[PDB]
Amino acid sequence: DKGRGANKDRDGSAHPDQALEQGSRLPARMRNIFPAELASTPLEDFDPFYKNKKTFVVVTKAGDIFRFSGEKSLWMLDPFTPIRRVAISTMVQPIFSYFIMITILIHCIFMIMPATQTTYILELVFLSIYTIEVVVKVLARGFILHPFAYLRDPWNWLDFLVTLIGYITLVVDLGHLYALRAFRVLRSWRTVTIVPGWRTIVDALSLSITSLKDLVLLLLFSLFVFAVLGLQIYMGVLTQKCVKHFPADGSWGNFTDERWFNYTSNSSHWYIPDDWIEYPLCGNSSGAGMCPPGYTCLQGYGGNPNYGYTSFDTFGWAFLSVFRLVTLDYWEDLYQLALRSAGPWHILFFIIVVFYGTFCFLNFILAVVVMSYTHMVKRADEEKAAERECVPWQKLQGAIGAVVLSPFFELFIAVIIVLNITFMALDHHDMNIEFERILRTGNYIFTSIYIVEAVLKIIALSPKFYFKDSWNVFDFIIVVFAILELGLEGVQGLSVFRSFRLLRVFRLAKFWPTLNNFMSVMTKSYGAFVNVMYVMFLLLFIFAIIGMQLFGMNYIDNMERFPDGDLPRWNFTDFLHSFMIVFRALCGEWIESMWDCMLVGDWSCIPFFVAVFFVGNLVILNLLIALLLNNYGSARDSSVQRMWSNIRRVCFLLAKNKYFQKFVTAVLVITSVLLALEDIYLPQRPVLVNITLYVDYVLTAFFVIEMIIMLFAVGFKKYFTSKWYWLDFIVVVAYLLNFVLMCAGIEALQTLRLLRVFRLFRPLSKVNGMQVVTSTLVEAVPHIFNVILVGIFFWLVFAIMGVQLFAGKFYKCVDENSTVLSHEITMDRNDCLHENYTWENSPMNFDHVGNAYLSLLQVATFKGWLQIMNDAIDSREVHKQPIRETNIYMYLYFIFFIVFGSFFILKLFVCILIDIFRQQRRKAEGLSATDSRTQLIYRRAVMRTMSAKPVKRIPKPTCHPQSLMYDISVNRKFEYTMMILIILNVAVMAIDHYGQSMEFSEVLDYLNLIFIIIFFVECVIKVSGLRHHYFKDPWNIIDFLYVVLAIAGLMLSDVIEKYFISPTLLRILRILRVGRLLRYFQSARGMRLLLLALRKALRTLFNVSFLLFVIMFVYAVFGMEFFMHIRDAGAIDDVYNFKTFGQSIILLFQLATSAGWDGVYFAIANEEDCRAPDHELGYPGNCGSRALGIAYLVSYLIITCLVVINMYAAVILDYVLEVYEDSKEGLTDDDYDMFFEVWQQFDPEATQYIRYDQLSELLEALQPPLQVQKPNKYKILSMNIPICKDDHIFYKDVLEALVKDVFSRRGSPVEAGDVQAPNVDEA
Ligand SMILES: *[C@@H]1O[C@H](CO)[C@@H](O[C@@H]2O[C@H](CO)[C@@H](O[C@@H]3O[C@H](CO[C@@H]4O[C@H](CO)[C@@H](O)[C@H](O)[C@@H]4O)[C@@H](O)[C@H](O[C@@H]4O[C@H](CO)[C@@H](O)[C@H](O)[C@@H]4O)[C@@H]3O)[C@H](O)[C@H]2NC(C)=O)[C@H](O)[C@H]1NC(C)=O
Ligand SMILES: *[C@@H]1O[C@H](CO)[C@@H](O[C@@H]2O[C@H](CO)[C@@H](O[C@@H]3O[C@H](CO)[C@@H](O)[C@H](O)[C@@H]3O)[C@H](O)[C@H]2NC(C)=O)[C@H](O)[C@H]1NC(C)=O
Ligand SMILES: *[C@@H]1O[C@H](CO)[C@@H](O[C@@H]2O[C@H](CO)[C@@H](O[C@@H]3O[C@H](CO)[C@@H](O)[C@H](O)[C@@H]3O)[C@H](O)[C@H]2NC(C)=O)[C@H](O)[C@H]1NC(C)=O
Ligand SMILES: *[C@@H]1O[C@H](CO)[C@@H](O[C@@H]2O[C@H](CO)[C@@H](O[C@@H]3O[C@H](CO)[C@@H](O)[C@H](O)[C@@H]3O)[C@H](O)[C@H]2NC(C)=O)[C@H](O)[C@H]1NC(C)=O
Ligand SMILES: *[C@@H]1O[C@H](CO)[C@@H](O[C@@H]2O[C@H](CO)[C@@H](O[C@@H]3O[C@H](CO)[C@@H](O)[C@H](O)[C@@H]3O)[C@H](O)[C@H]2NC(C)=O)[C@H](O)[C@H]1NC(C)=O
Ligand SMILES: *[C@@H]1O[C@H](CO)[C@@H](O[C@@H]2O[C@H](CO)[C@@H](O)[C@H](O)[C@H]2NC(C)=O)[C@H](O)[C@H]1NC(C)=O
Ligand SMILES: *[C@@H]1O[C@H](CO)[C@@H](O)[C@H](O)[C@H]1NC(C)=O
Known about the structure:
This protein is mostly helical and 1323 residues long.
């Protein structure tokens, strides 16, 4: 409406429409003394063929509506209808505009090469093309205002802006920068338009990003507290190397002052085991590493990790690496190196950082993306809604037709394939001569069947008609390329014809049900999907070519700061590297690039790989979840019976009861809590050896009675029946076997007795939340295993591909200490086996299908897929040796995998898990009848109204001038200004470097002294004022402790420490105050809007927190009795083992997010060495666990990284959707709170009334939309406001009346009666 009004005004008012370009015609507004072709209204045709065209255009417009016109608007100064006008007309019309795009696409193909041809001459061409074009557009429209409008309308912003700089670049200073080359390429962001609709998504990401601007102001604070924490805990913790002491009475030193600081400073003796290029962080808080013997562990000695840029000291680095954590990225180092350093207690920090920041604040962005995406599609549905509304031969033929119809044919068809699928499904490297010949026989047999089935159908029914069915068209395309296949391999050459065998595999979709369904919905977005796709490449391409010319000539020139290497594998030299390195950062690892970039490239790289992360991953790759979500929304007869009643009242009586029931649950806990402290060290000196064995017997004594009393009490028929009572019977089974082997026998079957842990489940669902989350898991799992059947399927395609070209390779020559030699000594399996030595494999190969399958999953979840992908590049024949650079075009094989694997399927687990979780909230709280999303809003408002009664208003004790104190405690001066002090106290901590002069130390000591005195005043003025309402007041309790500890700290003095304080918690409690601010944010109301959200979720969000704690505790104990001694090589550093119960959780929180599960897998799949465990005197158990691993990690990553950690996401995006939902319609919770705030003001003594005369003021004292501003008497008098004598009004009459107003002030129509009905019901 507003837009329309604006348009009308311009038609009026003081803009001019110069031309309207419509359907290849430029129709011509002029000049209020002067014309050209004003009329008709109506489909006339006054003049002319031009006239006719105009008429046609008009007609089209009337049909259509707005669509589509190109408006050039005008005055302004000059130009009536010769030369400028003509020019304008030319520009309006569209094939020219098609031109400039081309010269745009021509630059892209020209820029992507290298430098090569120096046509700078051809470079000079395209500028002059655009120099003309910069001229046409400013000539069309006008003059100084419209260069001011040419600034203005913003796609055009980029055509001027960039091309001045492209004009600048001819200008020559070769002085300073070559940044002129930098921003040249941005031109190609035009090319989005091309392709077709273009508009929800470009307009998605535009509405995606400028809503997130609010939210960014959150996390820029959100990071800034924790990087402080890291600064303040972790400062120069992350430099503990391990240094020797002395030759004591030896050779070096005496007086240990200027030489002990010298003998430790030299980087020649501190510990390295075997060239692990960096330096091996140590510890000496117990548990946390250490470090081998004759040593000790010092802090401040040279360097720090990856390339000097990990550590938490010096604030600005502490920002980057903490922001690493919120990304959840390669932290497998920054995990471990910290715990080698400090201790195994500091995951309690890393839970905060990862749990609180990056499990919230990466969802909060997805929250914004999906909301902004849905808001534009429903906006785009309005266009979608409006535009819609001989005899023998004959007999034979008949027979053929019959067989086509039959239950015969498709069956045997679907047989032949599930068999043919199986023939391609072997393709070994070894593949015995007889096996090879079998396989070759397989296809000539099976290819003929295809032609026959195909040759007969076409003949059985109707040629021209036969090509109506696309599947039969698809069926025909098989055997055309099948008969292609055969000739090449008669003929002799070549190669790629073979993989069109894999086009067969698709034939299966028609025979499926679930899969024709799945393939069908994407045939809904042949468009939306590929449009989303096209920008993802474009944005990335935009960053690819700016990366090359920008970082660029640094990799080749410097060349030597790298770890004694010439170039790394992920550089910025050509396009394909510089496309791959930017794509690597999109999926998201982006540090190891950005070490590698900044090490050599000085500064400017830091903005670039954060700009590829936000704009790349959190904006695009969360958008691609919103695409899948909006598309895939789919006497003894009585006496024994009296005993049978006595057993019914023994059991059914005793059974419902809490007091036994909790007695069972408590026991399962402390029995399983005993089960934690088992292993390696049980045989420690056998107090637990014995009780773990007592608890063994006396548990099974409790489980067999458990089983009687449940057996008889509830239900014979339905006890043997259902699932959670199955898991009991099977425990009781299971502990029955062990007794069975205490005498007649003997061993403990260990794993039988570990299904005791399995029953802790159903205390857990009962807990005061998980009822929601549980119901959403065990419901999920049917639809999950529907996706998975699918997700096999595409991987099944991609795998057997990679066998047909990958299989056989991955066999590099190696001397025993692992060195790929290089070349020239190597290049076949002869010259490495003819010398003597060891032509050996890489552990994640593509030899089999299951070997190729698992090794594809490492590139699925982006772990260890650098390490595959280098070897994959390098390999170039079956029995020859792989070389470092060659065969790099098939590094694009992964890109056609990683899209159709990782973003389209691995994130499709999210678009199941959100669709289920909205429904389970409906069956908690709600219904399924409303279903149109408004009635439910109304009901929730009604329930919110019914809720609150009032504050007390902590109302005064009397005096001395104690009264003063409460005149300042509640004031709006003191809370700001004392709070303002807390933000001051923060920024103190922000200044601090490592070890820093005393000069700085004296200052911070001085300033810390100041602030606590003011705080000590804050406390007692706060204390004397409210006193007990202090402690109903959460922050102040915290605000109280840090004060008290400060007096503990600084006051008496110390002596000694520990025995109270020490410096961790003192500073921790000081930082925890700064979260007082979320109270104070109420300013711009989109950001307090979303944080109300967070609390609405946190209690269900803690609940999911517990399952993750739990199925950790599950799989640690269950793995632990699997994963006793197993070497170590390569991510169980002999501190991060499955040995104890501590590290088994330290391990698995790494695996929780699935960061570093390859190198973990590589240990538990390591089969080389072993001394076979004898179960005798002796054994070194340190041996192996293949099948015991695959069925563990894959059973972990599906459970943790797929469902439950995305279940984490489904909670936040439900609630944050619900909240913007209310706000749109509606009435958030903030509003209700502010109402009672101001109600308290007017009703201090919580009488729950208010006087007649004060009502008007109360209606004035509210925030919109509840607020009825003065004058308001005539409006109030409108609402139903009953008064009790004498002239008092009750609150909820007021609440009801006021809230009923607002939905009025919102709306009209039919909701309202619904609302009324709801109210009535409530009453
Ligand atoms: C746990 O880990 C911590 C580190 O986080 C270890 O702490 C280290 O402990 C070492 C002893 O076990 C300390 O060595 C001492 O360090 C003194 C440092 O000297 C100062 O240097 C400044 C710099 O200019 C000088 O101005 C000062 O004047 C100091 O001299 C050595 O001087 C000291 O040498 C001894 O001194 C005594 C007198 O006190 C002599 O009689 C004796 O003959 C010997 O020369 C001594 O070597 C080390 O500094 C300390 N780390 C830090 C960063 O301070 C813990 O030891 C670890 N836990 C365990 C149980 O080992
Ligand atoms: C640990 O102490 C030793 C000596 O106890 C230090 O050795 C120093 O080694 C340097 C070699 O680089 C010697 O170089 C001298 O430098 C000056 C100025 O560059 C020059 O004029 C001399 O002709 C000579 O080249 C130096 O003599 C020697 N120091 C002493 C006191 O003799 C070593 O540097 C110490 N380690 C660390 C990490 O400081
Ligand atoms: C760090 O420690 C290493 C050894 O732990 C030091 O290397 C040593 O450097 C000294 C000179 O400072 C060398 O002494 C020289 O010996 C040769 C004969 O071998 C003689 O021709 C010279 O006149 C001089 O005396 C010593 O050989 C060398 N040893 C080793 C094993 O490398 C290094 O200097 C230390 N650096 C710092 C900064 O402390
Ligand atoms: C195992 O890996 C390392 C390379 O990463 C190599 O170990 C080195 O092996 C040599 C003997 O082959 C050790 O002895 C050295 O021999 C040279 C003469 O060639 C002599 O000048 C030295 O004083 C020393 O005696 C050498 O210490 C050792 N390196 C280390 C750091 O311990 C080796 O190439 C690999 N093994 C095989 C079989 O290739
Ligand atoms: C590494 O490969 C070389 C060959 O490239 C192997 O050397 C060969 O070793 C065998 C037995 O050790 C030698 O055969 C016998 O040698 C004795 C002399 O000791 C001779 O009297 C016999 O008549 C018989 O020929 C063979 O000559 C020798 N060849 C060469 C060229 O040295 C070696 O065994 C391989 N080592 C490993 C660890 O694989
Ligand atoms: C470390 O330095 C001290 C410096 O005093 C050495 O002590 C001297 O040692 C010599 C012989 O080694 C004696 O003749 C002196 O009398 C000692 N000085 C004193 C004050 O007693 C000490 O020997 C040195 N340590 C080593 C291992 O050489
Ligand atoms: C290469 O390997 C084949 C394997 O049969 C062998 O016969 C041949 O002699 C080898 N050639 C060289 C040059 O080592």
